[PDB]
Amino acid sequence: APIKKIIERYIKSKADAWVSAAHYNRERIKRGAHVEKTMVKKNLGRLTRLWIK
RNA sequence: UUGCCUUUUACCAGAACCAUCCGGGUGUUGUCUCCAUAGAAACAGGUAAAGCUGUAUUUUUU
């Protein structure tokens, strides 16, 4: 239980950090604000995944 | 924060703080260079020259 719980919490944290980041990236893309091609691709992928979820 | 852009340096152009630099005086010393060398004169007043003032009949002194 405890170890598992801790792991869960950290993955939640990661998600929070990740999802927010993705959102930010998307916003940037929408604007037209020096997005990296690779970064944009990642955002597209990540965002797609999020949508699916 | 923008822009070219999509990787970065190297860049666009604005902002705010900051620094660096190329320079600048001023003052005081110290030096370097070039020219130079006197340790005592005013008072009594003259001689000469420079600074300023002047040109008795009701309110100044006739």
Swiss-Prot record:
Taxonomy, superkingdom: Eukaryota
Location within or outside the cell: Nucleus
Comment text on domains: The MPN (JAB/Mov34) domain has structural similarity with deubiquitinating enzymes, but lacks the residues that would bind the catalytic metal ion.
Function: Functions as a scaffold that mediates the ordered assembly of spliceosomal proteins and snRNAs. Required for association of BRR2 with the spliceosomal U5 snRNP, and the subsequent assembly of the U4/U6-U5 tri-snRNP complex. Functions as a scaffold that positions spliceosomal U2, U5 and U6 snRNAs at splice sites on pre-mRNA substrates, so that splicing can occur. Interacts with both the 5' and the 3' splice site, as well as the branch region. Has a role in branch site-3' splice site selection. Associates with the branch site-3' splice 3'-exon region. Also has a role in cell cycle.
Quaternary structure (record): Component of the U4/U6-U5 tri-snRNP complex composed of the U4, U6 and U5 snRNAs and at least PRP3, PRP4, PRP6, PRP8, PRP18, PRP31, PRP38, SNU13, SNU23, SNU66, SNU114, SPP381, SMB1, SMD1, SMD2, SMD3, SMX2, SMX3, LSM2, LSM3, LSM4, LSM5, LSM6, LSM7, LSM8, BRR2 and DIB1.
Other comments on record: Present with 468 molecules/cell in log phase SD medium.
The name this protein goes by in its record: Pre-mRNA-splicing factor 8
Gene: PRP8
Residues of the full protein shown: 806 to 858 of 2413
